[PDB]
Write a protein that binds this ligand. Sequence first.
Ligand SMILES: *C(=O)/C=C/c1ccc(O)cc1
Length: 125
Amino acid sequence: MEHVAFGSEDIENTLAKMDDGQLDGLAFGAIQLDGDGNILQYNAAEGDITGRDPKQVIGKNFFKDVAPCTDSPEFYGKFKEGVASGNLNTMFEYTFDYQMTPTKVKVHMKKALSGDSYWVFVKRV
Ligand SMILES: *C(=O)/C=C/c1ccc(O)cc1
């Protein structure tokens, strides 16, 4: 395992050192998005939660293509305000229900330490 707790205050500094292989050792799902919502990184734990194959969703748009259930003011709306503002740090519960059994999760969205990238972290509840 990589030992990093979900919700940790300095998580963006810790994850700045990991490559795709290290990200697969986290105890929670991790997605890195660009400012348009395209998927740059997608770890093994996220694929275990949602059924998606990580290598197949990299490059797709999360809000348009992969996760239309998140295209709502409650999820995408928060993301886009964060990108526009250049700051984002929010945690909320959500249900993922597209082409899968409805699954309740906790989501943490946080701006990355690098400029135009954003993390989405997911764990079951
Ligand atoms: C709603 O459409 C949610 C879909 C979804 C969430 C998270 C993922 O990693 C993949 C699909």
